[PDB]
Amino acid sequence: ENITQWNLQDNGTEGIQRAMFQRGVNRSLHGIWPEKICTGVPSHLATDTELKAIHGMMDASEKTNYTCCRLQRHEWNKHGWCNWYNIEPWILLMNKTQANLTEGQPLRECAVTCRYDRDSDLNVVTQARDSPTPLTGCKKGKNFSFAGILVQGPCNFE
Ligand SMILES: *[C@@H]1O[C@H](CO)[C@@H](O[C@@H]2O[C@H](CO)[C@@H](O[C@@H]3O[C@H](CO[C@H]4O[C@H](CO)[C@@H](O[C@@H]5O[C@H](CO)[C@@H](O)[C@H](O)[C@@H]5O)[C@H](O)[C@@H]4O)[C@@H](O)[C@H](O[C@@H]4O[C@H](CO[C@H]5O[C@H](CO)[C@@H](O)[C@H](O)[C@@H]5O)[C@@H](O)[C@H](O)[C@@H]4O)[C@@H]3O)[C@H](O)[C@H]2NC(C)=O)[C@H](O)[C@H]1NC(C)=O
Ligand SMILES: *[C@@H]1O[C@H](CO)[C@@H](O[C@@H]2O[C@H](CO)[C@@H](O)[C@H](O)[C@H]2NC(C)=O)[C@H](O)[C@H]1NC(C)=O
Ligand SMILES: *[C@@H]1O[C@H](CO)[C@@H](O[C@@H]2O[C@H](CO)[C@@H](O)[C@H](O)[C@H]2NC(C)=O)[C@H](O)[C@H]1NC(C)=O
Ligand SMILES: *[C@@H]1O[C@H](CO)[C@@H](O)[C@H](O)[C@H]1NC(C)=O
Ligand SMILES: *[C@@H]1O[C@H](CO)[C@@H](O)[C@H](O)[C@H]1NC(C)=O
Ligand SMILES: [Zn+2]
Ligand SMILES: [Zn+2]
């Protein structure tokens, strides 16, 4: 079982969260994490042409104006190659996961990190996953905002 984490838009968070806001993106895939973290030399070096096939995944780096392919390459190198063995299945899963994220809130969306906003008395979700996890930056007893969708608890089922 693989952790599936993604970023959520927020004008209040600098970096990708703000870029996503400006571009009308709500969810941008961060990664699919099996337990094993790749160490050592990748079996194949990912090209920009391969990495751009993950449509909708925005890079976390300003050095590419939040496009491709620093984050994508990093994901292949650190979590990809040693687990999927070939770039093809990995791009297919990554692309299809990002498609489901673009087509609204998934099956299980659980907050990972928040930015508590005093003006709206809300825990704005900056990163979510498909499994519950101890939170960070989330004020106790306050409601959650997953790219505008308001939820009672830390885990959103739509
Ligand atoms: C969660 O995360 C997991 C990773 O940690 C994901 O699992 C991986 O899934 C990918 C597919 O999405 C698998 O990738 C393929 O791997 C085979 C080789 O696998 C063989 O060896 C590994 C170990 O070395 C074993 O894998 C697993 O074993 C456990 C045992 O209990 C079981 O769970 C499964 O059996 C599982 O597979 C196992 O021994 C396995 O047999 C590659 O061959 C794949 O590449 C394909 O083959 C092409 C090369 O030649 C091919 O040419 C023709 C086409 O002309 C093909 O039809 C033939 O197959 C022929 O071989 C490639 O060029 C081409 O890209 C093609 O796709 C592919 O790399 C990977 O094994 C899984 N890894 C693990 C560790 O399980 C899991 O999907 C994730 N799940 C979710 C829900 O997110
Ligand atoms: C990646 O996912 C996209 C969807 O985000 C797939 O795009 C579809 O491609 C077919 C065939 O060209 C079109 O008929 C659909 O209209 C496309 N869908 C959308 C929503 O644009 C794409 O095929 C996927 N595969 C790869 C390898 O990138
Ligand atoms: C991002 O999420 C919002 C909802 O949180 C999407 O929809 C908004 O509301 C109506 C539908 O109820 C849409 O037609 C508007 O475009 C959205 N308005 C605002 C101000 O966000 C929105 O469409 C999603 N973005 C994408 C790319 O699908
Ligand atoms: C987005 O943030 C910038 C910088 O804090 C601010 O100037 C702008 O008014 C913000 N827009 C909204 C809609 O909050
Ligand atoms: C995408 O959505 C469908 C329907 O919710 C689901 O069955 C499928 O497993 C999802 N695909 C991925 C790659 O998460
Ligand atoms: Zn674990
Ligand atoms: Zn990583």
Side-chain angles (χ1 to χ4, degrees), residues 32-77:
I32 298 174
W33 315 314
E35 307 239 319
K36 163 173 243 304
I37 289 225
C38 307
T39 58
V41 185
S43 49
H44 164 93
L45 309 168
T47 76
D48 297 333
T49 307
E50 291 157 328
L51 299 165
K52 288 166 174 167
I54 312 171
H55 302 295
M57 174 171 171
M58 290 168 58
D59 182 353
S61 168
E62 74 179 356
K63 273 68 187 61
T64 89
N65 192 33
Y66 311 96
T67 61
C68 212
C69 316
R70 302 183 148 263
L71 179 61
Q72 294 89 163
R73 191 161 286 106
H74 173 73
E75 291 307 317
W76 169 251
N77 289 347

mmCIF file of all heavy atoms in Angstrom, residues 32-77:
data_model
loop_
_atom_site.group_PDB
_atom_site.id
_atom_site.type_symbol
_atom_site.label_atom_id
_atom_site.label_comp_id
_atom_site.label_asym_id
_atom_site.label_seq_id
_atom_site.Cartn_x
_atom_site.Cartn_y
_atom_site.Cartn_z
ATOM 1 N N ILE A 32 3.191 9.264 -5.436
ATOM 2 C CA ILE A 32 2.601 7.969 -5.103
ATOM 3 C C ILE A 32 3.728 7.261 -4.398
ATOM 4 O O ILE A 32 4.723 6.919 -5.022
ATOM 5 C CB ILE A 32 2.016 7.188 -6.297
ATOM 6 C CG1 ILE A 32 0.888 7.996 -6.926
ATOM 7 C CG2 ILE A 32 1.573 5.774 -5.850
ATOM 8 C CD1 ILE A 32 0.301 7.451 -8.173
ATOM 9 N N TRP A 33 3.612 7.122 -3.095
ATOM 10 C CA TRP A 33 4.704 6.591 -2.317
ATOM 11 C C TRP A 33 4.572 5.211 -1.728
ATOM 12 O O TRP A 33 4.036 5.054 -0.617
ATOM 13 C CB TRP A 33 5.191 7.604 -1.253
ATOM 14 C CG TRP A 33 5.344 9.010 -1.736
ATOM 15 C CD1 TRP A 33 5.954 9.412 -2.887
ATOM 16 C CD2 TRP A 33 4.963 10.207 -1.045
ATOM 17 N NE1 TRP A 33 5.919 10.782 -2.988
ATOM 18 C CE2 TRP A 33 5.326 11.298 -1.868
ATOM 19 C CE3 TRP A 33 4.356 10.466 0.197
ATOM 20 C CZ2 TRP A 33 5.145 12.628 -1.477
ATOM 21 C CZ3 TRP A 33 4.115 11.790 0.561
ATOM 22 C CH2 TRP A 33 4.520 12.856 -0.261
ATOM 23 N N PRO A 34 5.223 4.217 -2.376
ATOM 24 C CA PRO A 34 5.328 2.885 -1.768
ATOM 25 C C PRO A 34 6.277 3.006 -0.558
ATOM 26 O O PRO A 34 6.859 4.082 -0.379
ATOM 27 C CB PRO A 34 5.962 2.064 -2.898
ATOM 28 C CG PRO A 34 5.771 2.871 -4.147
ATOM 29 C CD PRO A 34 5.952 4.248 -3.658
ATOM 30 N N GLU A 35 6.441 1.951 0.282
ATOM 31 C CA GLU A 35 7.310 2.031 1.482
ATOM 32 C C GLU A 35 8.751 2.244 1.146
ATOM 33 O O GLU A 35 9.423 3.024 1.824
ATOM 34 C CB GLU A 35 7.164 0.790 2.409
ATOM 35 C CG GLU A 35 5.736 0.462 2.819
ATOM 36 C CD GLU A 35 5.418 0.452 4.303
ATOM 37 O OE1 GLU A 35 6.251 -0.059 5.081
ATOM 38 O OE2 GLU A 35 4.310 0.893 4.683
ATOM 39 N N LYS A 36 9.226 1.553 0.105
ATOM 40 C CA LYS A 36 10.607 1.614 -0.356
ATOM 41 C C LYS A 36 10.913 2.936 -1.023
ATOM 42 O O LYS A 36 10.209 3.353 -1.933
ATOM 43 C CB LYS A 36 10.897 0.427 -1.287
ATOM 44 C CG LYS A 36 12.134 0.535 -2.153
ATOM 45 C CD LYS A 36 12.404 -0.772 -2.884
ATOM 46 C CE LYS A 36 13.726 -1.341 -2.439
ATOM 47 N NZ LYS A 36 14.848 -0.367 -2.644
ATOM 48 N N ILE A 37 11.972 3.588 -0.561
ATOM 49 C CA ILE A 37 12.476 4.832 -1.129
ATOM 50 C C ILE A 37 13.673 4.438 -1.956
ATOM 51 O O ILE A 37 14.553 3.752 -1.441
ATOM 52 C CB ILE A 37 12.823 5.865 -0.025
ATOM 53 C CG1 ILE A 37 11.508 6.390 0.597
ATOM 54 C CG2 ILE A 37 13.755 6.994 -0.568
ATOM 55 C CD1 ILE A 37 11.383 7.829 0.823
ATOM 56 N N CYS A 38 13.689 4.807 -3.220
ATOM 57 C CA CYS A 38 14.809 4.444 -4.074
ATOM 58 C C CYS A 38 16.087 5.103 -3.621
ATOM 59 O O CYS A 38 16.097 6.288 -3.297
ATOM 60 C CB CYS A 38 14.522 4.745 -5.541
ATOM 61 S SG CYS A 38 12.992 4.026 -6.157
ATOM 62 N N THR A 39 17.145 4.312 -3.555
ATOM 63 C CA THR A 39 18.491 4.770 -3.217
ATOM 64 C C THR A 39 19.381 4.229 -4.314
ATOM 65 O O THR A 39 19.117 3.161 -4.874
ATOM 66 C CB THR A 39 18.897 4.358 -1.782
ATOM 67 O OG1 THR A 39 18.829 2.936 -1.659
ATOM 68 C CG2 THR A 39 18.022 5.044 -0.683
ATOM 69 N N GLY A 40 20.369 4.995 -4.687
ATOM 70 C CA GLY A 40 21.246 4.547 -5.752
ATOM 71 C C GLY A 40 20.892 5.092 -7.115
ATOM 72 O O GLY A 40 20.094 6.037 -7.247
ATOM 73 N N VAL A 41 21.510 4.492 -8.136
ATOM 74 C CA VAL A 41 21.363 4.922 -9.520
ATOM 75 C C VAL A 41 20.081 4.415 -10.203
ATOM 76 O O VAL A 41 19.891 3.194 -10.287
ATOM 77 C CB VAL A 41 22.638 4.596 -10.309
ATOM 78 C CG1 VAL A 41 22.552 5.139 -11.729
ATOM 79 C CG2 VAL A 41 23.859 5.146 -9.578
ATOM 80 N N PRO A 42 19.220 5.333 -10.743
ATOM 81 C CA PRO A 42 18.011 4.878 -11.435
ATOM 82 C C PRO A 42 18.292 3.957 -12.611
ATOM 83 O O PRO A 42 19.310 4.076 -13.273
ATOM 84 C CB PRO A 42 17.351 6.184 -11.913
ATOM 85 C CG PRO A 42 17.859 7.219 -11.008
ATOM 86 C CD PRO A 42 19.284 6.811 -10.737
ATOM 87 N N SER A 43 17.379 3.021 -12.846
ATOM 88 C CA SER A 43 17.444 2.071 -13.946
ATOM 89 C C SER A 43 17.304 2.790 -15.303
ATOM 90 O O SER A 43 17.863 2.339 -16.297
ATOM 91 C CB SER A 43 16.371 1.015 -13.758
ATOM 92 O OG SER A 43 15.113 1.605 -13.482
ATOM 93 N N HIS A 44 16.606 3.936 -15.322
ATOM 94 C CA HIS A 44 16.376 4.767 -16.503
ATOM 95 C C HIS A 44 16.290 6.221 -16.059
ATOM 96 O O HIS A 44 15.672 6.507 -15.035
ATOM 97 C CB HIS A 44 15.074 4.328 -17.220
ATOM 98 C CG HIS A 44 14.511 5.303 -18.221
ATOM 99 N ND1 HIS A 44 14.840 5.237 -19.569
ATOM 100 C CD2 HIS A 44 13.614 6.299 -18.047
ATOM 101 C CE1 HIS A 44 14.157 6.204 -20.156
ATOM 102 N NE2 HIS A 44 13.402 6.868 -19.282
ATOM 103 N N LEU A 45 16.889 7.135 -16.836
ATOM 104 C CA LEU A 45 16.828 8.574 -16.568
ATOM 105 C C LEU A 45 15.618 9.138 -17.306
ATOM 106 O O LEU A 45 15.479 8.934 -18.515
ATOM 107 C CB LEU A 45 18.120 9.313 -16.969
ATOM 108 C CG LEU A 45 19.466 8.742 -16.444
ATOM 109 C CD1 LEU A 45 20.635 9.375 -17.133
ATOM 110 C CD2 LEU A 45 19.571 8.820 -14.912
ATOM 111 N N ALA A 46 14.698 9.760 -16.551
ATOM 112 C CA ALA A 46 13.447 10.307 -17.057
ATOM 113 C C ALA A 46 13.723 11.565 -17.868
ATOM 114 O O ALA A 46 14.508 12.433 -17.454
ATOM 115 C CB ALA A 46 12.498 10.608 -15.905
ATOM 116 N N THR A 47 13.091 11.653 -19.039
ATOM 117 C CA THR A 47 13.231 12.811 -19.926
ATOM 118 C C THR A 47 12.032 13.728 -19.722
ATOM 119 O O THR A 47 10.951 13.256 -19.330
ATOM 120 C CB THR A 47 13.257 12.366 -21.399
ATOM 121 O OG1 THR A 47 11.922 12.037 -21.821
ATOM 122 C CG2 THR A 47 14.169 11.199 -21.631
ATOM 123 N N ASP A 48 12.189 15.011 -20.103
ATOM 124 C CA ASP A 48 11.094 15.969 -20.016
ATOM 125 C C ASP A 48 9.866 15.526 -20.810
ATOM 126 O O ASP A 48 8.731 15.715 -20.350
ATOM 127 C CB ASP A 48 11.539 17.350 -20.448
ATOM 128 C CG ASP A 48 12.619 17.983 -19.590
ATOM 129 O OD1 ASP A 48 12.708 17.640 -18.383
ATOM 130 O OD2 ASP A 48 13.338 18.855 -20.106
ATOM 131 N N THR A 49 10.097 14.874 -21.964
ATOM 132 C CA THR A 49 9.024 14.389 -22.839
ATOM 133 C C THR A 49 8.184 13.351 -22.125
ATOM 134 O O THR A 49 6.964 13.391 -22.235
ATOM 135 C CB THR A 49 9.588 14.006 -24.237
ATOM 136 O OG1 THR A 49 10.331 15.122 -24.769
ATOM 137 C CG2 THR A 49 8.518 13.627 -25.225
ATOM 138 N N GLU A 50 8.829 12.462 -21.345
ATOM 139 C CA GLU A 50 8.128 11.418 -20.569
ATOM 140 C C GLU A 50 7.365 12.076 -19.410
ATOM 141 O O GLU A 50 6.160 11.876 -19.257
ATOM 142 C CB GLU A 50 9.110 10.371 -20.011
ATOM 143 C CG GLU A 50 9.765 9.483 -21.051
ATOM 144 C CD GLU A 50 11.080 8.836 -20.649
ATOM 145 O OE1 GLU A 50 11.845 9.441 -19.861
ATOM 146 O OE2 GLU A 50 11.367 7.734 -21.167
ATOM 147 N N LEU A 51 8.067 12.912 -18.628
ATOM 148 C CA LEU A 51 7.496 13.589 -17.470
ATOM 149 C C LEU A 51 6.309 14.500 -17.792
ATOM 150 O O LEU A 51 5.338 14.521 -17.010
ATOM 151 C CB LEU A 51 8.564 14.265 -16.623
ATOM 152 C CG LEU A 51 9.620 13.305 -16.037
ATOM 153 C CD1 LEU A 51 10.853 14.061 -15.519
ATOM 154 C CD2 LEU A 51 9.020 12.355 -15.004
ATOM 155 N N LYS A 52 6.313 15.148 -18.988
ATOM 156 C CA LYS A 52 5.192 16.005 -19.392
ATOM 157 C C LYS A 52 3.918 15.205 -19.722
ATOM 158 O O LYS A 52 2.823 15.782 -19.800
ATOM 159 C CB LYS A 52 5.592 16.966 -20.502
ATOM 160 C CG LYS A 52 6.521 18.074 -20.020
ATOM 161 C CD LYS A 52 7.179 18.807 -21.174
ATOM 162 C CE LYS A 52 7.997 20.009 -20.755
ATOM 163 N NZ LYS A 52 8.848 20.473 -21.891
ATOM 164 N N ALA A 53 4.038 13.867 -19.860
ATOM 165 C CA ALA A 53 2.875 13.030 -20.131
ATOM 166 C C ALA A 53 1.961 12.936 -18.906
ATOM 167 O O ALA A 53 0.855 12.422 -19.027
ATOM 168 C CB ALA A 53 3.311 11.640 -20.584
ATOM 169 N N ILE A 54 2.422 13.397 -17.726
ATOM 170 C CA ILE A 54 1.632 13.415 -16.491
ATOM 171 C C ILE A 54 0.918 14.750 -16.597
ATOM 172 O O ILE A 54 1.460 15.752 -16.134
ATOM 173 C CB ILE A 54 2.504 13.312 -15.183
ATOM 174 C CG1 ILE A 54 3.548 12.162 -15.249
ATOM 175 C CG2 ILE A 54 1.594 13.144 -13.944
ATOM 176 C CD1 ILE A 54 4.577 12.130 -14.117
ATOM 177 N N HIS A 55 -0.227 14.789 -17.322
ATOM 178 C CA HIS A 55 -0.960 16.035 -17.559
ATOM 179 C C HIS A 55 -1.631 16.545 -16.324
ATOM 180 O O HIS A 55 -2.450 15.841 -15.718
ATOM 181 C CB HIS A 55 -1.961 15.935 -18.740
ATOM 182 C CG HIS A 55 -1.305 15.549 -20.034
ATOM 183 N ND1 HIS A 55 -0.375 16.390 -20.664
ATOM 184 C CD2 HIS A 55 -1.375 14.385 -20.726
ATOM 185 C CE1 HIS A 55 0.082 15.705 -21.698
ATOM 186 N NE2 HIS A 55 -0.504 14.499 -21.785
ATOM 187 N N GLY A 56 -1.307 17.781 -15.975
ATOM 188 C CA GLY A 56 -1.944 18.453 -14.856
ATOM 189 C C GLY A 56 -1.118 18.535 -13.609
ATOM 190 O O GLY A 56 -1.450 19.313 -12.714
ATOM 191 N N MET A 57 -0.074 17.710 -13.517
ATOM 192 C CA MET A 57 0.807 17.735 -12.360
ATOM 193 C C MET A 57 1.715 18.956 -12.528
ATOM 194 O O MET A 57 2.463 19.026 -13.505
ATOM 195 C CB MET A 57 1.628 16.437 -12.236
ATOM 196 C CG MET A 57 2.640 16.502 -11.136
ATOM 197 S SD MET A 57 3.425 14.930 -10.796
ATOM 198 C CE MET A 57 4.661 15.460 -9.704
ATOM 199 N N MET A 58 1.603 19.927 -11.615
ATOM 200 C CA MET A 58 2.440 21.117 -11.614
ATOM 201 C C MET A 58 3.638 20.873 -10.708
ATOM 202 O O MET A 58 3.519 20.281 -9.624
ATOM 203 C CB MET A 58 1.683 22.333 -11.097
ATOM 204 C CG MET A 58 0.611 22.840 -12.022
ATOM 205 S SD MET A 58 -0.457 24.047 -11.207
ATOM 206 C CE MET A 58 0.737 25.299 -10.694
ATOM 207 N N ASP A 59 4.800 21.355 -11.152
ATOM 208 C CA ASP A 59 6.074 21.250 -10.462
ATOM 209 C C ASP A 59 5.999 22.219 -9.283
ATOM 210 O O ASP A 59 5.341 23.261 -9.380
ATOM 211 C CB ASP A 59 7.192 21.654 -11.447
ATOM 212 C CG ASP A 59 8.642 21.601 -10.996
ATOM 213 O OD1 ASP A 59 8.897 21.348 -9.790
ATOM 214 O OD2 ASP A 59 9.520 21.805 -11.842
ATOM 215 N N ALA A 60 6.650 21.856 -8.170
ATOM 216 C CA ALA A 60 6.664 22.637 -6.945
ATOM 217 C C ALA A 60 7.693 23.781 -6.982
ATOM 218 O O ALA A 60 7.651 24.651 -6.098
ATOM 219 C CB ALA A 60 6.926 21.711 -5.774
ATOM 220 N N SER A 61 8.585 23.799 -8.013
ATOM 221 C CA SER A 61 9.691 24.768 -8.193
ATOM 222 C C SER A 61 9.386 26.016 -9.036
ATOM 223 O O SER A 61 8.865 25.884 -10.153
ATOM 224 C CB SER A 61 10.908 24.055 -8.768
ATOM 225 O OG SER A 61 11.909 24.953 -9.208
ATOM 226 N N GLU A 62 9.782 27.226 -8.533
ATOM 227 C CA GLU A 62 9.575 28.482 -9.293
ATOM 228 C C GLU A 62 10.510 28.588 -10.491
ATOM 229 O O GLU A 62 10.217 29.324 -11.441
ATOM 230 C CB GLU A 62 9.651 29.756 -8.419
ATOM 231 C CG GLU A 62 11.042 30.168 -7.951
ATOM 232 C CD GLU A 62 11.129 31.437 -7.115
ATOM 233 O OE1 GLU A 62 10.089 32.107 -6.913
ATOM 234 O OE2 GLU A 62 12.251 31.765 -6.664
ATOM 235 N N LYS A 63 11.620 27.813 -10.441
ATOM 236 C CA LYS A 63 12.664 27.734 -11.453
ATOM 237 C C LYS A 63 12.141 27.263 -12.806
ATOM 238 O O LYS A 63 12.871 27.405 -13.786
ATOM 239 C CB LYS A 63 13.850 26.888 -10.960
ATOM 240 C CG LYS A 63 14.904 27.654 -10.163
ATOM 241 C CD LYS A 63 14.463 28.173 -8.768
ATOM 242 C CE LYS A 63 15.462 29.072 -8.082
ATOM 243 N NZ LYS A 63 15.751 30.319 -8.853
ATOM 244 N N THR A 64 10.879 26.736 -12.873
ATOM 245 C CA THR A 64 10.174 26.313 -14.097
ATOM 246 C C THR A 64 8.769 26.999 -14.147
ATOM 247 O O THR A 64 7.896 26.604 -14.947
ATOM 248 C CB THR A 64 10.022 24.764 -14.185
ATOM 249 O OG1 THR A 64 8.821 24.328 -13.539
ATOM 250 C CG2 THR A 64 11.231 23.998 -13.673
ATOM 251 N N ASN A 65 8.557 28.011 -13.262
ATOM 252 C CA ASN A 65 7.298 28.729 -13.090
ATOM 253 C C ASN A 65 6.158 27.699 -12.864
ATOM 254 O O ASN A 65 5.130 27.711 -13.553
ATOM 255 C CB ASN A 65 7.031 29.722 -14.245
ATOM 256 C CG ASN A 65 5.904 30.736 -14.042
ATOM 257 O OD1 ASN A 65 5.630 31.211 -12.926
ATOM 258 N ND2 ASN A 65 5.241 31.117 -15.145
ATOM 259 N N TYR A 66 6.394 26.765 -11.911
ATOM 260 C CA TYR A 66 5.440 25.739 -11.511
ATOM 261 C C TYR A 66 4.852 24.907 -12.673
ATOM 262 O O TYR A 66 3.645 24.692 -12.732
ATOM 263 C CB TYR A 66 4.372 26.346 -10.578
ATOM 264 C CG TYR A 66 5.001 27.165 -9.468
ATOM 265 C CD1 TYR A 66 5.135 28.551 -9.583
ATOM 266 C CD2 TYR A 66 5.587 26.545 -8.366
ATOM 267 C CE1 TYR A 66 5.782 29.304 -8.599
ATOM 268 C CE2 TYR A 66 6.228 27.289 -7.372
ATOM 269 C CZ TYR A 66 6.325 28.668 -7.495
ATOM 270 O OH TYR A 66 6.966 29.392 -6.521
ATOM 271 N N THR A 67 5.706 24.438 -13.589
ATOM 272 C CA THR A 67 5.269 23.633 -14.734
ATOM 273 C C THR A 67 5.841 22.176 -14.674
ATOM 274 O O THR A 67 5.221 21.295 -14.077
ATOM 275 C CB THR A 67 5.501 24.386 -16.079
ATOM 276 O OG1 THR A 67 6.895 24.651 -16.257
ATOM 277 C CG2 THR A 67 4.739 25.686 -16.175
ATOM 278 N N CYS A 68 7.022 21.947 -15.290
ATOM 279 C CA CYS A 68 7.720 20.648 -15.363
ATOM 280 C C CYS A 68 9.206 20.994 -15.430
ATOM 281 O O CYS A 68 9.540 22.122 -15.811
ATOM 282 C CB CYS A 68 7.273 19.866 -16.599
ATOM 283 S SG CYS A 68 7.282 18.057 -16.406
ATOM 284 N N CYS A 69 10.131 20.088 -15.020
ATOM 285 C CA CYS A 69 9.875 18.713 -14.581
ATOM 286 C C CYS A 69 10.679 18.363 -13.305
ATOM 287 O O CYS A 69 10.909 17.172 -13.014
ATOM 288 C CB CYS A 69 10.199 17.726 -15.702
ATOM 289 S SG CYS A 69 9.610 18.215 -17.335
ATOM 290 N N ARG A 70 11.110 19.368 -12.539
ATOM 291 C CA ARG A 70 11.892 19.136 -11.323
ATOM 292 C C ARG A 70 11.249 18.163 -10.321
ATOM 293 O O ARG A 70 11.876 17.138 -9.966
ATOM 294 C CB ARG A 70 12.334 20.455 -10.691
ATOM 295 C CG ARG A 70 13.153 21.320 -11.641
ATOM 296 C CD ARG A 70 13.640 22.571 -10.971
ATOM 297 N NE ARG A 70 14.938 22.999 -11.495
ATOM 298 C CZ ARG A 70 16.104 22.723 -10.921
ATOM 299 N NH1 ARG A 70 16.148 21.998 -9.804
ATOM 300 N NH2 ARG A 70 17.233 23.166 -11.455
ATOM 301 N N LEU A 71 9.979 18.450 -9.917
ATOM 302 C CA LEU A 71 9.234 17.611 -8.985
ATOM 303 C C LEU A 71 8.958 16.240 -9.574
ATOM 304 O O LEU A 71 9.223 15.239 -8.913
ATOM 305 C CB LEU A 71 7.951 18.312 -8.501
ATOM 306 C CG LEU A 71 7.039 17.540 -7.534
ATOM 307 C CD1 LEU A 71 7.744 17.192 -6.236
ATOM 308 C CD2 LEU A 71 5.705 18.250 -7.344
ATOM 309 N N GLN A 72 8.480 16.184 -10.824
ATOM 310 C CA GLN A 72 8.226 14.935 -11.569
ATOM 311 C C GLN A 72 9.469 14.072 -11.596
ATOM 312 O O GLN A 72 9.391 12.933 -11.150
ATOM 313 C CB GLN A 72 7.754 15.227 -12.994
ATOM 314 C CG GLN A 72 6.393 15.915 -13.059
ATOM 315 C CD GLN A 72 6.413 17.442 -13.018
ATOM 316 O OE1 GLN A 72 5.422 18.098 -13.366
ATOM 317 N NE2 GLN A 72 7.491 18.055 -12.540
ATOM 318 N N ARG A 73 10.647 14.642 -12.009
ATOM 319 C CA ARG A 73 11.929 13.903 -12.042
ATOM 320 C C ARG A 73 12.316 13.396 -10.668
ATOM 321 O O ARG A 73 12.718 12.232 -10.521
ATOM 322 C CB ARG A 73 13.056 14.727 -12.643
ATOM 323 C CG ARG A 73 14.287 13.891 -12.930
ATOM 324 C CD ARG A 73 15.237 14.542 -13.928
ATOM 325 N NE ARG A 73 14.720 14.474 -15.292
ATOM 326 C CZ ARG A 73 14.223 15.521 -15.923
ATOM 327 N NH1 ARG A 73 14.243 16.720 -15.348
ATOM 328 N NH2 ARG A 73 13.722 15.389 -17.145
ATOM 329 N N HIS A 74 12.141 14.266 -9.660
ATOM 330 C CA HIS A 74 12.428 13.910 -8.302
ATOM 331 C C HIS A 74 11.598 12.710 -7.870
ATOM 332 O O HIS A 74 12.123 11.806 -7.247
ATOM 333 C CB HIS A 74 12.171 15.097 -7.405
ATOM 334 C CG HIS A 74 12.296 14.733 -5.966
ATOM 335 N ND1 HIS A 74 13.549 14.486 -5.373
ATOM 336 C CD2 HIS A 74 11.323 14.524 -5.052
ATOM 337 C CE1 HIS A 74 13.279 14.157 -4.121
ATOM 338 N NE2 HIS A 74 11.956 14.188 -3.874
ATOM 339 N N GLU A 75 10.311 12.690 -8.228
ATOM 340 C CA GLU A 75 9.401 11.595 -7.882
ATOM 341 C C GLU A 75 9.794 10.294 -8.534
ATOM 342 O O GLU A 75 9.716 9.242 -7.898
ATOM 343 C CB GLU A 75 7.947 11.935 -8.209
ATOM 344 C CG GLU A 75 7.360 13.016 -7.315
ATOM 345 C CD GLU A 75 7.484 12.777 -5.828
ATOM 346 O OE1 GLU A 75 7.239 11.629 -5.395
ATOM 347 O OE2 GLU A 75 7.813 13.738 -5.096
ATOM 348 N N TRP A 76 10.233 10.355 -9.795
ATOM 349 C CA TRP A 76 10.687 9.157 -10.478
ATOM 350 C C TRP A 76 11.959 8.628 -9.804
ATOM 351 O O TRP A 76 12.059 7.433 -9.549
ATOM 352 C CB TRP A 76 10.926 9.437 -11.965
ATOM 353 C CG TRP A 76 11.633 8.312 -12.670
ATOM 354 C CD1 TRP A 76 12.913 8.312 -13.138
ATOM 355 C CD2 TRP A 76 11.109 7.011 -12.934
ATOM 356 N NE1 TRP A 76 13.214 7.094 -13.694
ATOM 357 C CE2 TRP A 76 12.121 6.277 -13.592
ATOM 358 C CE3 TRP A 76 9.876 6.390 -12.686
ATOM 359 C CZ2 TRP A 76 11.935 4.959 -14.012
ATOM 360 C CZ3 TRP A 76 9.692 5.079 -13.100
ATOM 361 C CH2 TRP A 76 10.722 4.371 -13.731
ATOM 362 N N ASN A 77 12.899 9.515 -9.497
ATOM 363 C CA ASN A 77 14.185 9.154 -8.928
ATOM 364 C C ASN A 77 14.131 8.591 -7.535
ATOM 365 O O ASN A 77 14.812 7.599 -7.256
ATOM 366 C CB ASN A 77 15.096 10.366 -8.930
ATOM 367 C CG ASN A 77 15.576 10.779 -10.281
ATOM 368 O OD1 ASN A 77 15.462 10.069 -11.272
ATOM 369 N ND2 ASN A 77 16.161 11.940 -10.344
#
